[PDB]
């Protein structure tokens, strides 16, 4: 569709076929207090091996909604803002983002996130994030 992904991808994601299980221990849970109350997130820190720069993959504990824009920025470190806006627009018209006043960025349900993970070559990392415990 109206889509073209960035050219350079985080070397962390060269192989989409690796088993995710060894990654699950590295997730962390964190509670964030919002005006309407606390909510729990599961986060996985992904350090690009060559720029040494860390990004968080993030998941809501209650319904496993995953931040698609966090996935995008970890996958494509040298992406322009126009490239990001283009793909987030794509996610809107082709997947089913959730709407949530409290969190920034575009979040999507688990099955949508795994569809993106195939496109971004991040399937082991989203699988580990989704299978991680919140407790």
């Amino acid at each position: 569709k109206s889509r073209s992904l960035p050219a350079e991808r985080n070397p962390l994601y060269k192989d989409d076929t690796l088993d995710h299980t060894p990654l699950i221990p590295k997730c962390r849970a964190q509670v964030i207090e919002f005006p309407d109350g606390p909510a729990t997130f599961v986060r996985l820190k992904c350090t690009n091996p060559e720029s040494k720069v860390p990004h968080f993959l993030m998941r809501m504990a209650k319904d496993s909604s995953i931040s698609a824009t966090s996935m995008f920025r970890s996958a494509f470190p040298k992406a322009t803002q126009e490239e990001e806006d283009l793909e987030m627009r794509w996610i809107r018209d082709n997947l089913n983002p959730i709407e949530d006043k409290r969190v920034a960025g575009l979040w999507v349900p688990p099955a949508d996130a795994l569809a993106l993970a195939k496109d971004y070559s991040m399937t082991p990392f989203i699988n580990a994030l989704l299978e991680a415990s919140s407790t």
Binding site: Q30, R43, P54, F56, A104
Partner: peptide, 17 residues
Amino acid sequence: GPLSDNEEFENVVKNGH
């Protein structure tokens, strides 16, 4: 240790950076 990243995670969640 893991507390070092609490603040930047929460700011990314709430404000995107």
